[PDB]
Write a protein that binds this ligand. Structure first.
Ligand code: HEM
Ligand code: HEM
Ligand code: HEM
Ligand code: HEM
Ligand code: HEM
Ligand code: HEM
Ligand code: HEM
Ligand code: HEM
Ligand code: HEM
Ligand code: HEM
Ligand code: HEM
Ligand code: HEM
Ligand code: HEM
Ligand code: HEM
Ligand SMILES: [Zn+2]
Ligand SMILES: [Zn+2]
Ligand SMILES: [Zn+2]
Ligand SMILES: [Zn+2]
Ligand SMILES: [Zn+2]
Ligand SMILES: [Zn+2]
Ligand SMILES: [Zn+2]
Ligand SMILES: [Zn+2]
Ligand SMILES: [Zn+2]
Ligand SMILES: [Zn+2]
Ligand SMILES: [Zn+2]
Ligand SMILES: [Zn+2]
Ligand SMILES: [Zn+2]
Ligand SMILES: [Zn+2]
Ligand SMILES: [Zn+2]
Ligand SMILES: [Zn+2]
Ligand SMILES: [Zn+2]
Ligand SMILES: [Zn+2]
Ligand SMILES: [Zn+2]
Ligand SMILES: [Zn+2]
Ligand SMILES: [Zn+2]
Ligand SMILES: [Zn+2]
Ligand SMILES: [Zn+2]
Ligand SMILES: [Zn+2]
Ligand SMILES: [Zn+2]
Ligand SMILES: [Zn+2]
Ligand SMILES: [Zn+2]
Ligand SMILES: [Zn+2]
Ligand SMILES: [Zn+2]
Ligand SMILES: [Zn+2]
Lengths: 9, 106, 106, 106, 106, 106, 106, 106, 9, 106, 106, 106, 106, 106, 9
């Protein structure tokens, strides 16, 4: 989840 | 947004940051930059449209945005702390990354 | 999901994209692919189990998924614009990345 | 949180995992580690402040955190499956990555 | 997803449950099966396309899915209680319902 | 909404679907129909107001809405795929279900 | 919740509705009943444990809950309009369904 | 929704308010009216198709909807206080506004 | 949850 | 809230803004003022009770609130930039608008 | 954002709409325009700095934005129906409104 | 809000409750009181600004708000049941608690 | 829920915990107990209706619930850690608190 | 988190507040402290393990945390107003409460 | 969570 959240949020 | 749109957003918001006198304005501008850079990360520029995704070139292109995103994150961290001058200085430093990619791929 | 399950998800949805005739179906399938890749990127494959985490092999392995995730985003961008055929063409390009990792590590 | 705070979070939660006797405590600790590493990724450590953002040192530094995030993910995958001892073993192995970056840049 | 896709999802996740060694994996698989069955309930299979919506065949067809959804729910209730082996046994029993509908309408 | 209100909604939106030239309009109309049919499912019509809930009559009445809901779902699946003509054809087929119930219970 | 727990929930809340003097209390109680019925519908009662899942007995059992859920919705619709006495009368009718299933299967 | 459909929504919900016996029903109808009027506000009616956005007629047309929206709010405020008859009277007075616009532009 | 979601959503 | 209560809200929050020493406090007060004015916009004051919704007076009354709401937005924009004194001055200028309406309709 | 920045947003997104080849792109651009215009509505331009909020000029200035916002809504409605060319034509007509305000107040 | 602000809110809303003719008004007023009392709970009043937090005095001061919050909760429970007169009576009873604290600490 | 309802909830869920064979069932039951106690805290029991809100009896009564809530929290902390038997033992110990309050005020 | 973990959280974040130079950092730290105190309040410390739950010692223990939570709220209120130095001074006062409980029970 | 929710919600 962490890589994804790093951009989106 | 397309590649040019995202570049317009990056450029516009760098200017907003430079002229800003408050943290809210700086934070908002940096957030828009983050979004634009994130979208540009998976784009293919005109000069590499024939190239391999596994090529030194497309590798390097993507890397440039990942680098930029990291730097925007760092500036955002400062803006969230209300540090206007420091966040503006961090935004100014982004330009070297902007320029490096342009020299190679624009 | 284990590595095998995530590979099944990738394979199934890539086939869904090929046979698709609408943007929503393509978008759904790509969304599922991104989630599977997000899970798989941190796995250690059977043929690399005795390798160091900082080995060239594990670096390359993780890198393959990041490449894949990037390409899924390019396909998603097109599907979000309702460009079914272009998104499908972008998804076919994904297969080069699938093939490259398999050739080395599967 | 600054780099030092994020390191404290990393160190504290590693100890929590070591002493843990249940999956929930291991899961929570790893979740906090992931968030700390994600925040630290964009930082510039004192010993690299003089270095270019595009330097081999800064590349290697940021790389360490994504290596760490990947390993945290693998550990959490095990913890989510209720495999406490295996997740604890995986957390123990994180130290190699902690140590490697420290030896170079701490 | 079309009927065939939903069937692939059903088949795949049944296998996942069979090989699973933890409650979380069983829970996730059953959750996906429930969603697949829910989507398939409203479909018209090839061999019943010529039949009236109010036909005994179409009634029986839709009934099979609600039978299946109920059994999936009972299995998930067991999985949520951490009863892996019992949920796996319950998932095994689903096959009777799979087979019965297939024998008539597949 | 009362029974008559829900019937008005069903009738109005069938007309909207018939005249529609875009998927958004069709999807919106079908969503309103789904909501109306779901609400009408637990209503008691004037001609059955004295009847047993466990009666062949109230059984059949409820069944009619469950049937209709399934058919609306199928049409909605098509509209979500941007298939205007196909979704309009599916909506047209609903009329047999509308009519069947009216013949018995209106 | 097991079958017995769900039955306790149904019984308690039906009594709450009888003694209620306001719409909110009636609505809360009915909401709790619907959730208990949602859980119970997929259970297998002690007296039907040796029966086939597709038996007339298990068909009838599941059907009883669907009937109950339908009637709860009719009562909820009335409570949402603030019609306390009418909702209470509708809830009393629920008891016919309670009684019917008990007579056969309890 | 197109203008005609928004008008159907206004008309139907005015009838619902007239026949209503509870606040919830009036509130629901007024809420739907507010949404329909809000959509219709930016529409150009057939009889004003060749007219400029800044024309006296188009100013008047848009004002009619702003007028109606204000009155719907006033009625909504009354419904929210459970004042059914007062809200119904406010809804009845809307007709003056409906009729005035129709005389000019319908 | 599934039957409920089938209508509401 | 009735008109009198909305006025109490306007009056109290104007005093809060006057005494405020921080942006958060000013922002909070202005937000509450915006909500009170929005509610009051569709009210009919005692002195205009027998007047038509389309009367010159009622147009003027509603315009007064639109005027106030616009100024509150302008003040809010300033508060959101942390410009406390400037936001306070904008709030002070609201009084002209308060007073003008009172002279006519209070 | 200040007035100048909102204007940059209006200008850029008008260009995006002109070059667009899909509904999503037009919708996105129009949504950003609506937000920029909404912010600009309560601003005081340099050339009207010494003017009263209730002045003829400031009424006219605010009306210009309300005019633009209404047209953006009309264009948005068209984009939401996938009518790309029609939405583009509606966007092109906005220029009259842009130009009219500029002639007076820019 | 500061201590005086919260006291103003408590006093204003007690008056709103006393004059109210509907449950919505009473519920809204009591909700605002709950919020105000919760905020005042951690405040230090002028007459105790030199005192120990562990002092009989600050203990007692905090206790007064905890008492008041409990009483507001009880009144809120009644308002949620639509019981206007009963909730108004409960609100009236609050005054003894208001007064007790004022006698000691105002 | 009234005091008696909340007591029924407390009593029922204590029995559920006693018979439970899994953490999920224990967690759910304790969660319901916490909510019931939270609702009951603000109530006035029949035998204390004549007592002042500031009476030693009413203080002691409210205190019992916060004692109970604390113990429920400790039990749930154990249940969240998958420690079923320990949470069940903790739930057993709750009875002392139940009994103590009953002996005085039931 | 166990008692020791929560104490580590309290200690770390109190130090973060001292060294902080911005409101956001202070707010984050206080937020983390409140969550740790929320977890810890229901714990039983080693030195009070053989004490009754209704003992003066356990009453006092729980009371210490409630005192702490109150003081954290006072500090949060100040940080939310951007008053860094005042919030920091308020946080230093927290230490009296830390010290008092430790002197008796640590 | 319960004490916290008692005020906030
Ligand atoms: C492996 C983790 C990730 C997953 C699972 C993921 C998934 C997705 C999905 C499914 C969408 C489509 C959203 C929709 O239209 O419904 C999306 C959009 C997008 N993603 Fe990611 N993504 C990931 C990582 C990233 C990263 C690292 C970046 C930045 C470099 C990024 C940037 C974006 C952008 C700019 C969009 C379009 C705008 C938006 O919806 O946020 N994503 N992502
Ligand atoms: C914040 C830093 C950046 C700024 C301010 C910026 C700004 C711009 C601007 C104003 C343009 C002209 C757009 C146009 O032709 O309409 C442009 C083009 C371009 N930029 Fe950037 N940019 C930045 C970062 C980057 C990075 C990091 C890369 C590569 C990794 C990159 C790659 C390109 C390319 C390939 C073009 C040519 C696009 C085309 O001709 O279609 N830019 N940029
Ligand atoms: C979208 C592109 C991809 C597709 C369609 C795909 C498909 C598959 C399939 C169908 C399998 C067989 C799974 C089974 O045993 O049932 C597999 C296995 C495997 N794949 Fe992929 N894959 C893709 C991307 C990748 C990438 C990018 C990597 C490496 C970076 C990779 C590495 C592997 C490995 C290591 C296995 C062996 C799994 C095992 O035996 O445990 N795959 N793949
Ligand atoms: C789970 C693994 C890790 C643990 C347990 C850990 C722990 C720590 C601790 C306890 C400190 C001292 C903090 C202080 O001075 O108060 C520290 C400092 C530091 N660590 Fe880590 N660390 C880990 C991972 C990493 C990684 C992967 C990197 C590099 C990619 C890294 C880079 C640094 C740096 C640059 C400092 C010096 C910070 C400063 O002086 O400002 N650490 N670490
Ligand atoms: C968990 C139980 C089930 C499993 C594992 C399962 C599996 C499958 C599989 C693997 C297929 C072949 C898909 C393909 O052609 O690619 C299939 C087809 C089919 N199944 Fe199922 N199924 C199940 C339940 C059901 C039920 C309950 C029904 C009827 C109520 C049903 C009706 C059908 C039909 C009509 C087809 C033919 C689809 C077509 O040819 O278009 N299935 N199933
Ligand atoms: C989409 C399909 C349907 C449409 C378009 C439709 C339309 C209508 C219309 C326009 C009315 C007249 C309403 C009035 O008297 O004011 C009506 C009445 C009625 N409908 Fe339907 N209907 C549909 C489906 C159904 C179904 C499936 C059932 C039974 C399961 C049903 C049962 C009834 C009954 C009992 C009445 C009489 C209501 C009364 O007199 O109070 N309808 N319907
Ligand atoms: C709202 C209506 C209903 C009420 C008030 C109700 C109430 C109850 C109660 C109080 C019990 C005793 C539980 C215990 O052992 O402590 C019970 C048992 C039972 N009920 Fe219901 N019930 C209702 C609906 C139904 C329905 C619709 C069915 C079947 C479709 C059903 C089937 C059963 C069965 C099989 C048992 C035996 C449970 C066991 O011994 O394990 N009930 N019911
Ligand atoms: C609650 C008050 C209103 C009601 C009940 C109402 C009702 C209706 C109805 C039933 C129609 C016929 C739609 C059809 O052709 O099927 C209609 C048409 C129309 N109404 Fe209204 N209306 C109301 C308010 C307004 C207002 C305030 C305006 C102007 C500001 C307006 C302007 C129009 C126009 C221009 C048409 C013709 C649409 C066309 O031919 O395309 N209406 N109205
Ligand atoms: C921020 C500016 C304003 C402030 C501070 C303010 C304050 C007040 C106050 C304290 C009252 C007495 C309420 C009472 O009886 O307890 C009042 C009444 C009133 N105000 Fe305002 N007001 C403002 C804006 C406006 C505006 C813009 C209008 C007209 C558009 C207006 C119209 C009225 C009317 C009609 C009353 C009499 C209410 C009645 O007697 O029922 N006010 N105002
Ligand atoms: C979509 C239509 C519009 C477009 C494309 C547009 C575009 C622009 C642009 C590019 C600027 C120059 C900003 C700068 O200095 O960098 C500007 C300035 C300005 N515009 Fe607009 N505009 C639009 C609508 C409007 C409207 C409707 C109004 C009046 C109601 C308006 C009032 C102004 C004013 C007062 C300035 C001068 C700002 C200043 O000097 O501080 N604009 N506009
Ligand atoms: C609902 C019950 C209450 C009402 C209606 C109420 C009302 C008021 C009012 C109108 C004021 C004057 C504010 C001002 O000077 O501007 C005030 C002041 C004050 N109240 Fe209350 N109050 C209530 C409850 C309480 C409680 C329970 C306490 C103590 C636990 C308390 C402590 C104080 C203190 C210390 C002041 C003086 C504030 C100052 O001078 O700065 N109040 N109250
Ligand atoms: C888990 C612990 C508890 C359990 C299992 C429990 C159970 C019960 C039960 C079964 C009743 C009878 C309800 C009825 O009359 O229908 C009751 C009544 C009562 N309980 Fe509790 N209780 C508990 C905790 C408490 C506590 C801590 C207090 C006081 C702080 C309390 C105060 C009361 C009072 C005042 C009544 C009488 C209600 C009335 O007659 O209106 N209970 N309790
Ligand atoms: C913000 C104020 C507080 C701070 C900074 C603080 C800090 C600490 C620290 C650093 C420890 C040592 C933990 C360890 O063994 O690693 C500790 C232990 C302890 N503290 Fe606190 N504390 C605070 C508040 C409190 C309060 C209010 C209480 C009692 C109501 C309390 C009771 C205890 C107890 C009983 C221990 C022993 C834990 C054990 O050995 O298991 N503390 N505290
Ligand atoms: C132990 C459980 C509690 C926790 C963890 C907690 C936590 C917090 C936090 C972190 C904030 C800051 C919100 C922000 O600005 O981001 C806050 C605000 C606040 N708290 Fe609490 N709190 C608790 C209990 C309470 C209680 C019991 C009360 C009432 C007596 C209360 C009343 C308030 C009020 C009035 C605010 C400011 C407005 C708001 O954000 O709700 N809190 N709380
Ligand atoms: Zn884009
Ligand atoms: Zn620009
Ligand atoms: Zn590569
Ligand atoms: Zn997985
Ligand atoms: Zn598959
Ligand atoms: Zn490495
Ligand atoms: Zn940070
Ligand atoms: Zn680099
Ligand atoms: Zn589907
Ligand atoms: Zn049928
Ligand atoms: Zn209804
Ligand atoms: Zn109609
Ligand atoms: Zn039946
Ligand atoms: Zn259950
Ligand atoms: Zn019970
Ligand atoms: Zn069957
Ligand atoms: Zn529309
Ligand atoms: Zn105009
Ligand atoms: Zn109001
Ligand atoms: Zn008018
Ligand atoms: Zn702005
Ligand atoms: Zn004016
Ligand atoms: Zn406050
Ligand atoms: Zn006031
Ligand atoms: Zn104390
Ligand atoms: Zn209650
Ligand atoms: Zn007291
Ligand atoms: Zn804990
Ligand atoms: Zn620490
Ligand atoms: Zn005690």
């Amino acid at each position: 989840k962490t890589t994804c959240n790093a951009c989106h949020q | 947004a397309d590649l040019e749109d995202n570049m317009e957003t990056l450029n516009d918001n760098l200017k907003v940051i430079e002229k800003a006198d408050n943290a809210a304005q700086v934070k908002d501008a940096l957030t828009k930059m983050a979004a634009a850079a994130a979208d540009a990360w998976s784009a293919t520029p005109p000069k590499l449209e024939d190239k391999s995704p596994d090529s030194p070139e497309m590798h390097d292109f993507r890397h440039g945005f990942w680098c930029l995103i990291g730097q925007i994150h760092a500036a955002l961290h400062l803006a969230n702390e209300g540090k206007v001058k420091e966040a503006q200085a961090a935004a100014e430093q982004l330009k070297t990354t902007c320029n490096a990619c342009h020299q190679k791929y624009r």
